[PDB]
Every structure is written in C-alpha cells, then in structure tokens.
Amino acid sequence: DVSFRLSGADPSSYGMFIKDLRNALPHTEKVYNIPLLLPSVSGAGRYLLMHLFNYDGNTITVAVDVTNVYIMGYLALTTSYFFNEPAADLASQYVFRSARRKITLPYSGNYERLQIAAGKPREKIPIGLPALDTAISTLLHYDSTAAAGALLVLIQTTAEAARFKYIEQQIQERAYRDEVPSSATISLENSWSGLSKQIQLAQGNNGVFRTPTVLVDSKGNRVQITNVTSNVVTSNIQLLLNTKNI
Ligand SMILES: *[C@@H]1O[C@H](CO)[C@@H](O[C@@H]2O[C@H](CO)[C@@H](O)[C@H](O)[C@H]2NC(C)=O)[C@H](O)[C@H]1NC(C)=O
Ligand SMILES: Cn1cnc2nc(N)[nH]c(=O)c21
C-alpha cells in the first residue's frame, strides 16, 4: 500500500509519494523506456490501496485499479463508496469487505459524468495540495455533489500526476496554493489513452506514430506529436495503458 500525509507535506514528500505510487504498479516490460501496464490481473491483486491523511490526521483509503490507475471507490471510517459502473462493482468484491455499509455513488467515474454532477468543468476547479486536504475532508462525510468535486481533485492530484511528470510538477507548484489547471494539463489528461496507443504502435514502425496526437502546450499553442523523440514521450509520460484496454 502507499501512503501520503498532507500534514508536513512539502513538494519533496509529494514527489516521493507519487514515485511510490508509480512503483506500486506492476509491469513486465517497458516500451521505449516507459512502463507498460498489465493487460489484466486476477483477483484482489488488481487493486492498490492508497491511505490518504488530511492535515488533521483523518484518513480515507482509496482503491485504485492497477491496470489503468482508475479510482474505483474508497472507504471513510466504516462506509465504502464505489462508483456506479461495472468495474467499480467488480472491485467491491475484493476490497473494503469489512465495511458496515457500501454506498454506490449516483454516477460513474469518468470526467464527463463527474463534471456534470459537480456542476462545473475541471477548468474552473482549483487543484493543489491544499485542495487535496479539502477533498479528503469532504469525502469523510457523504454528499454526492460535494464528492464529485472532491473526486475530480483527488483523481488529478494522484492518478494524473502518476501518469505525467508535468502534472506532478504542476501540483508541486501548488503545494501551498491552489490554482485551476492549465489547458496543457487538461489536454494531457485527455490524451493518456491516445498517446499510450500511439507509442505502442510506433514499436514496429521506427518510433513513428501511426496517427499524430494533438495537445496544447505550456503557452496554450496547439502542437502535434508525431514520433517518440518528442519531449512528451522522452520526459513527460510515465505509464502506458496497454492497448488491450482501449
Ligand atoms: C519527430 O519530432 C521532432 C520534434 O521533436 C521533429 O523535429 C523537427 O526538428 C525540430 C526539432 O527536432 C522540430 O522543431 C522541427 O519543427 C521539425 N522539423 C521537421 C523535420 O519537420 C521531427 O521532424 C519529427 N521527426 C519525425 C516526424 O520523424
Ligand atoms: C481519470 N479517470 C478516467 N476515467 C476514470 N474512471 C474511474 N472509475 N476512475 C478514474 O480515476 C478515471
């Protein structure tokens, strides 16, 4: 299991937690030097448990699917909360079984559905470590509308940071001050799948992408990624969703 305590957290400890998270994910092979995530895994070994502690010491345990890094649900004291979707439901059979009651949230865990339930797109929700602290706080006591917002912050300050060096860096800059995400961040978040597929399709194609991937950069200018020599591939992305899942 991996743990992170917001109390006494600085950019450095966060970096270590995200490194720990990355190393918690299994993989047998690397593609162009980046860990390729497993196609599938059997039983309880498919889920990673994250223990998160807010500033006051309260905690929630989050269950993450190790083949994609998707959050499936979490535990607050004695109530387990799971997304309203098949995979999440499958996940309820191996984790948080000793919970007194299990609640199914009224939405599945994809950005589109979470942004609807939250009432705002993630362009306008501030993220950072202070926000993570709030997120944890908000999940300790049920409120489907509040949880949507908190989960959008949680998914990004953990899963998305794990997948992209850039996003981990964005969060370290927001260690004592929240700030809405840059469009580069949103763009990356949205391309993890495409990039993952294209970096794999370049393996028997001299490192050249079958189809170019379009992102928005630091400045907000539209850019095209056609090949693995790009910074995004050489230095940004840290995990690859196996094509068997796309
Ligand atoms: C692969 O991507 C690189 C960019 O990392 C392309 O780079 C060209 O050369 C410089 C720096 O590498 C770029 O800024 C230029 O805009 C590019 N000029 C060209 C040749 O178009 C490189 O071209 C790409 N190579 C491919 C497509 O195999
Ligand atoms: C980032 N992301 C995209 N679809 C997702 N679906 C679930 N269930 N959890 C996630 O963290 C997620």
UniProtKB/TrEMBL annotation:
Residues annotated to bind CDP: 70-71, 85, 110-112, 163
Which positions are annotated as binding CTP?
70-71, 85, 110-112, 122, 160, 163
Q: Under which main EC class is this enzyme filed? A: hydrolase
Q: Which InterPro entries match?
A: Ribosome-inact_prot_sf, Ribosome_inactivat_1/2, Ribosome_inactivat_prot, Ribosome_inactivat_prot_CS, Ribosome_inactivat_prot_sub1, Ribosome_inactivat_prot_sub2
Q: Where does cytidine bind?
A: 70-71, 85, 111, 160, 163
Instruction: State the UniProt keywords alphabetically.
Output: Hydrolase, Nucleotide-binding, Plant defense, Protein synthesis inhibitor, Toxin
Task: List positions binding N-acetyl-alpha-D-glucosamine.
Answer: 71, 111, 163
The chemistry this enzyme catalyses reads: Endohydrolysis of the N-glycosidic bond at one specific adenosine on the 28S rRNA
Q: Where does guanine bind?
A: 71, 109, 160, 163
> Which residues does the annotation say bind CMP?
70-71, 85, 111-112, 163
Q: Where does adenine 1 bind?
A: 70-71, 109
- The residues that hold L-ascorbate are 71, 109, 111
Record-annotated residues binding UTP? 69, 71, 111, 160, 163
Please indicate which superkingdom the organism of origin belongs to: Eukaryota
Q: Which residues bind beta-D-fructose?
A: 109, 111, 163
One Pfam entry name: RIP
What residues bear carbohydrate chains? 227
The biological process GO terms on file are: defense response; negative regulation of translation
Question: Its Enzyme Commission number?
Answer: 3.2.2.22
Per UniProt, UDP binds at 69, 111, 163
**Binding-site positions, adenine 2:** 71, 109
Q: What protein family is recorded?
A: Belongs to the ribosome-inactivating protein family. Type 1 RIP subfamily.
Provide the protein name. rRNA N-glycosylase
Species this chain originates from: Momordica balsamina (Bitter gourd)
> Coding gene?
RIP
